[PDB]
Amino acid sequence: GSDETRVPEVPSSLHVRPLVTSIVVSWTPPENQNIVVRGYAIGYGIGSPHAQTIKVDYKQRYYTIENLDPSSHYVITLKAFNNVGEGIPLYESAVTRPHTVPDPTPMMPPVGVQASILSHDTIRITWADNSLPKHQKITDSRYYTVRWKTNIPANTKYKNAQATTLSYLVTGLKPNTLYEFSVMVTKGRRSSTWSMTAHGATASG
Amino acid sequence: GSDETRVPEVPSSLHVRPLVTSIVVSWTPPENQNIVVRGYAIGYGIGSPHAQTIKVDYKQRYYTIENLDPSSHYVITLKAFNNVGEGIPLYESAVTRPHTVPDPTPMMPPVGVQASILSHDTIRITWADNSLPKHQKITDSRYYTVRWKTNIPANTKYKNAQATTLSYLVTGLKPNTLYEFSVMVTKGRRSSTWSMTAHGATAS
Amino acid sequence: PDPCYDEHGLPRRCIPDFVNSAFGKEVKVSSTCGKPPSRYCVVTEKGEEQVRSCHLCNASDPKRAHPPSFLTDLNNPHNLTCWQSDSYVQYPHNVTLTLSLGKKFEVTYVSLQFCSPRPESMAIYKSMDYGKTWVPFQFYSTQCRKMYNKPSRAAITKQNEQEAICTDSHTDVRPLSGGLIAFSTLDGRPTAHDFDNSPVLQDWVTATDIKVTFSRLHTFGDENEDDSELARDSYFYAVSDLQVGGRCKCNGHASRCVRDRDDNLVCDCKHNTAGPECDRCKPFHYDRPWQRATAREANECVACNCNLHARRCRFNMELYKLSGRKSGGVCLNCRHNTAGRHCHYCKEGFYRDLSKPISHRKACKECDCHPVGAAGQTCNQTTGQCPCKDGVTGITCNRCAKGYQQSRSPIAPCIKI
Amino acid sequence: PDPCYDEHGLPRRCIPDFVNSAFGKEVKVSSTCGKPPSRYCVVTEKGEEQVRSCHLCNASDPKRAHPPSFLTDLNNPHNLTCWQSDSYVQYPHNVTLTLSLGKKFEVTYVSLQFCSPRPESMAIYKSMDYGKTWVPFQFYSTQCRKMYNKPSRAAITKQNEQEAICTDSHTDVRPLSGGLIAFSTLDGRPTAHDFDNSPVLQDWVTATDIKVTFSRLHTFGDENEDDSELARDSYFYAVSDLQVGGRCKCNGHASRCVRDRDDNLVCDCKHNTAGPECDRCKPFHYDRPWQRATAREANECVACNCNLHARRCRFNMELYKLSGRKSGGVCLNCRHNTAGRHCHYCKEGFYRDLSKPISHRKACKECDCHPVGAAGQTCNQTTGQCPCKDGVTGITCNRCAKGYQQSRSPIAPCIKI
Ligand SMILES: *[C@@H]1O[C@H](CO)[C@@H](O)[C@H](O)[C@H]1NC(C)=O
Ligand SMILES: *[C@@H]1O[C@H](CO)[C@@H](O)[C@H](O)[C@H]1NC(C)=O
Numbered sequence A: 001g002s003d004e005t006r007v008p009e010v011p012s013s014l015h016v017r018p019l020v021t022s023i024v025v026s027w028t029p030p031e032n033q034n035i036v037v038r039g040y041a042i043g044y045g046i047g048s049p050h051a052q053t054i055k056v057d058y059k060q061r062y063y064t065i066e067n068l069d070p071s072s073h074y075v076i077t078l079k080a081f082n083n084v085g086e087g088i089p090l091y092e093s094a095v096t097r098p099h100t101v102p103d104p105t106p107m108m109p110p111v112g113v114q115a116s117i118l119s120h121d122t123i124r125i126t127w128a129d130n131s132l133p134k135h136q137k138i139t140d141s142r143y144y145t146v147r148w149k150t151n152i153p154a155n156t157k158y159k160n161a162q163a164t165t166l167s168y169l170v171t172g173l174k175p176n177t178l179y180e181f182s183v184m185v186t187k188g189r190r191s192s193t194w195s196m197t198a199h200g201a202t203a204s205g
Numbered sequence B: 001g002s003d004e005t006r007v008p009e010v011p012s013s014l015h016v017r018p019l020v021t022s023i024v025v026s027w028t029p030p031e032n033q034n035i036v037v038r039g040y041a042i043g044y045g046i047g048s049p050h051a052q053t054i055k056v057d058y059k060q061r062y063y064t065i066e067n068l069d070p071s072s073h074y075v076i077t078l079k080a081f082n083n084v085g086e087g088i089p090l091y092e093s094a095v096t097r098p099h100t101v102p103d104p105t106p107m108m109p110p111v112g113v114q115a116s117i118l119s120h121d122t123i124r125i126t127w128a129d130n131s132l133p134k135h136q137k138i139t140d141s142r143y144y145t146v147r148w149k150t151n152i153p154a155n156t157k158y159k160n161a162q163a164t165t166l167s168y169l170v171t172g173l174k175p176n177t178l179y180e181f182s183v184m185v186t187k188g189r190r191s192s193t194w195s196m197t198a199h200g201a202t203a204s
Numbered sequence C, D: 001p002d003p004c005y006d007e008h009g010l011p012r013r014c015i016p017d018f019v020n021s022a023f024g025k026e027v028k029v030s031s032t033c034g035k036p037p038s039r040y041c042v043v044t045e046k047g048e049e050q051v052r053s054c055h056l057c058n059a060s061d062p063k064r065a066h067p068p069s070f071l072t073d074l075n076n077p078h079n080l081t082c083w084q085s086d087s088y089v090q091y092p093h094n095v096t097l098t099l100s101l102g103k104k105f106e107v108t109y110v111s112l113q114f115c116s117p118r119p120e121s122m123a124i125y126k127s128m129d130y131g132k133t134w135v136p137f138q139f140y141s142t143q144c145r146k147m148y149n150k151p152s153r154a155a156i157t158k159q160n161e162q163e164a165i166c167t168d169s170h171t172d173v174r175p176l177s178g179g180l181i182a183f184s185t186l187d188g189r190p191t192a193h194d195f196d197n198s199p200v201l202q203d204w205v206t207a208t209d210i211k212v213t214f215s216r217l218h219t220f221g222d223e224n225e226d227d228s229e230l231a232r233d234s235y236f237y238a239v240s241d242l243q244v245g246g247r248c249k250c251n252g253h254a255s256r257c258v259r260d261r262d263d264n265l266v267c268d269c270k271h272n273t274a275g276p277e278c279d280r281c282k283p284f285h286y287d288r289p290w291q292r293a294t295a296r297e298a299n300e301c302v303a304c305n306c307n308l309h310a311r312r313c314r315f316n317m318e319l320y321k322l323s324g325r326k327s328g329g330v331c332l333n334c335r336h337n338t339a340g341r342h343c344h345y346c347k348e349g350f351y352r353d354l355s356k357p358i359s360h361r362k363a364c365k366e367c368d369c370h371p372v373g374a375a376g377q378t379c380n381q382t383t384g385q386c387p388c389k390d391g392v393t394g395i396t397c398n399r400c401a402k403g404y405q406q407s408r409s410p411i412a413p414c415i416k417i
């Protein structure tokens, strides 16, 4: 049936799906269908839904609120209305959040890491990449990160530097100390875990 | 207020305490006190409360049903009434049961029980009682119960006999079989545990 | 005030109140007088003089009417309300009252209080499923063999305890009014005292529906020469009160019955049981088989032990027997990477993190076995040692062993100097 | 459909619906117009022109009445209902609206929608107990120092997150009507993003009561004197709608609030928790300290392990620490003759019956130590061997050792042949 004598009742359900800069609001009409609903008014805001109100017709079961600040807490109110006025609201709050991009399949770490000891000061380490043609020259944009730490004790904070080539020179080091080396490859958004660790000790000079 | 226009409502609570041949019924008056209550009617019976009805006045919170049978299931109905009639009943069922007497403090078992093997057929065992004067003669009425069983295998159901004296002759036995004997004292309603076991084996 | 549990805090057998289950209820009858307004006559005795007075049933004169409502209504000895059958419904014909309880009941008795002379023959049937099937409860007749094809009052044994019997009791034509028939369900049955531990008897006493059928009328009075109808209109069935006394059946695990969301009646099961009659164990609580309360043991259901890595379980009878009849529960779909009967150890590819207790989300920590250096991802649960390759050693197989060095092959990562 | 638990079957943080807690409620006000009938004037703008119109407030004519049901009633932009104060209440007078929620709420905001110009100065206080004590929530003023003695808009720091601030925001006329003041409880507070894990902030948003007080009026309009009164009757407070938005505070252990037996509002406690806010553990689940749900862990309370020899326990922090932070529960009043932390062994004078599983009413069996033959009633728990006397043997010490025979003495029951 249809009745315009009064304001519509409260909507049957309200649901909110937060996205990065946007929020998708979905709902269902009031239980008693005898009361005419002309449309739906959606209030929304940060901390409270008084910031902005958007009206849609009675046929809409969903709407996407756009142009919202990121990492923010939005309160959202959903009402139904006819020529009498607006009905009793439902409230729901949601927080905009950065989308979580699924992790890319990992690359295979560099292999054949070897340490050649030049001096007390420096150690040169080299490796190979099986993701490269046997001539081992770079085309696509890659970079290798090389980390080293002191083997004694079982812990030391790693120091790392990068390379656009398959060789790298470790420079500032402690004389007569065993060192633990390792390297990973990263290409575009994909990376690899750290390679097998190679050890080497400085010249004690 | 006070109202006789209608029958009283149902009573607020009903409880039954079964005893050996009687049953104690206790209750509380219906909630609304505006309805006048002249009395309470208690129906009762075995399997169903149609056997007998007993009426009491409005002042009673309890009644004891007597002359009931003794291990029997009784259904009991409790109504309140005024000059209009009887109200809606409460039901409860209970079972008369034997009282549980236990337990008298236990006696000290006989001591120095000894087994003398007379024959292949019979074995005569003797004992002592430290609850008796050193002459070991009976005055008060005591009796000692004597049990025996075969030691092989680990169990056999016991055979027992009673005695008014401190010796007893166990007859009717298997030749060349090891037997376990023991004795207990009972005096009046008090009893004792079984004594230390004495063993003996019958003759060839 | 939970009767199902001790002074504290353990459980115990609890039973619903003894009630008349037929009270509020409406009982369906095959016959009632008023449809046209009809005549009926009652015969009374004063000395050896009989006096027959006649009245009219008129089912729209709430005064002269005798509806089946009057069977289950309030019983007041002063104002008596009686349902009344049609005038002279006689053998081979019979009149049937049928009453539905709605719940499984353990019925201690069924009793009828008559406004007419009692029947010479009457039968009581029950239903243990809901109106779907009927089985005999009790039979009453003067001649049992010729009527119900049952022997007259007969000795029941520990075998036939569920056998409905037939007695000539309560068949006597007097009292001419206020006569009473009381059928006790446990009467004369050998194991009755042991009813608590006797399942056949617990079954026998169980009914969801009660149906009585009045087979034959006592013909009592002096035939009148004017109209035979006077002696005909004086023969009928009339009942003041219908009662099914008993307790709502919850198998000893509930202290009351209440109506659920669908407004049908069910037990308020407690003891970790579920079901209408508390006939089954509540979810995740079947570590041991269900059992009715014996008034010695409450026999409550016991929750499965999972380490809080799952709530789903199923019972295993074999594992129960091996447990010494203690715990037969096993856990389903252990989450948080654990696995086992109780989820007490780690899935393949993980190992136990002992900084975290076994019930911790992180109790099982993944062993990351080096892609290049290890021969597989499944490590030892205890040590966390990965399955290292031929020339490699390490916990994760992340380095070459001594006297070895890295090669340029992924397949054989380490070789000898 | 229980949001407090997983797709199956484990638990998770659940929170009640976001609501306006001020809606059904009745608000107590310090001032209201209609008694006796009073005059009030509204000033409107057309271009730059003021038009001052005057009306009557008749507390008893339901058409010109402005009762404070019109604060919490349905908000309809078409037919607007406004509570309205006495005509001239000015500094240092103030008008107080005071609202009681009935339950602890985590309050996201407090908002007033005015039918008059907004106040120049306004204060918001809360109560975290039920109206016994009040502490400041928010302050709004043109001059904050001279009015509320609080600094003007100030940086809140991770030191004081709970400091009520004072801003000149929303103190502006205009609008002359339909003005809006919205106080966000988490606005400007550094740790807000971490609110789930920030206890001080969880406290800050918790209130059982809200009290707003309007301190000072904006003086707006031109005094034209035949009578000054026309401009005087035009300065008052009026608000069409009051809203305190937020969620019922269940500490993440409940998805809804429901009416109690006393019609109190309480959380519908899940995750084995109790209390009105679900702030404590359910009576038997003491095995580890209570904790609020973090949206990672649900932190449900876990039941004590007693072997079904007790339903009472208490937590022990030391035993918890030693368990590797797993289980700190110890058991009270162990029945069935058992004893131990978990009631896992037998009381003095009893021993373990291994015919029976450790959880059994009969699991602990009394060792019968012969009165004459044994040296004490306390036997060995594992074997059941009694402390036999000299020359005595047997489990119960009921017989004489090899090479011995019974004497007549109780002290030395056995001697040698
Ligand atoms: C039966 O009773 C109803 C109610 O008085 C009446 O309408 C109907 O006419 C009556 N007829 C009889 C008594 O035959
Ligand atoms: C009194 O009896 C008549 C006929 O027996 C019945 O219709 C009526 O309902 C009774 N009144 C009450 C209060 O039970």
Ligand SMILES: *[C@@H]1O[C@H](CO)[C@@H](O)[C@H](O)[C@H]1NC(C)=O
Pocket (backbone or CB within 6 Å): C092, C093, C094, C123, C213, C214, C215
């Ligand atoms: C009821 O009567 C019918 C026929 O009138 C008969 O077939 C049936 O056996 C009867 N039932 C009983 C229980 O007497």
Ligand SMILES: *[C@@H]1O[C@H](CO)[C@@H](O)[C@H](O)[C@H]1NC(C)=O
Pocket (backbone or CB within 6 Å): D037, D056, D058, D059, D060, D061
């Ligand atoms: C307020 O209402 C009552 C009834 O409406 C009336 O007596 C009174 O006149 C009204 N206000 C005024 C103008 O006094």
Ligand SMILES: *[C@@H]1O[C@H](CO)[C@@H](O)[C@H](O)[C@H]1NC(C)=O
Pocket (backbone or CB within 6 Å): D062, D063, D076, D079, D080, D081, D082
């Ligand atoms: C509408 O407003 C008028 C005056 O504002 C009030 O008298 C009436 O009660 C209100 N009714 C509704 C439905 O809002």
Ligand SMILES: *[C@@H]1O[C@H](CO)[C@@H](O)[C@H](O)[C@H]1NC(C)=O
Pocket (backbone or CB within 6 Å): D092, D093, D094, D123, D213, D214, D215
């Ligand atoms: C309210 O007014 C009184 C006196 O008029 C004053 O003492 C008090 O400080 C005022 N409170 C507020 C919050 O303005």
Ligand SMILES: [Ca+2]
Pocket (backbone or CB within 6 Å): C070, C071, C072, C073, C074, C075, C076, C080, C081, C082, C240, C241
């Ligand atoms: Ca009746």
Ligand SMILES: [Ca+2]
Pocket (backbone or CB within 6 Å): D070, D071, D072, D073, D074, D075, D076, D080, D081, D082, D240, D241
């Ligand atoms: Ca309003």
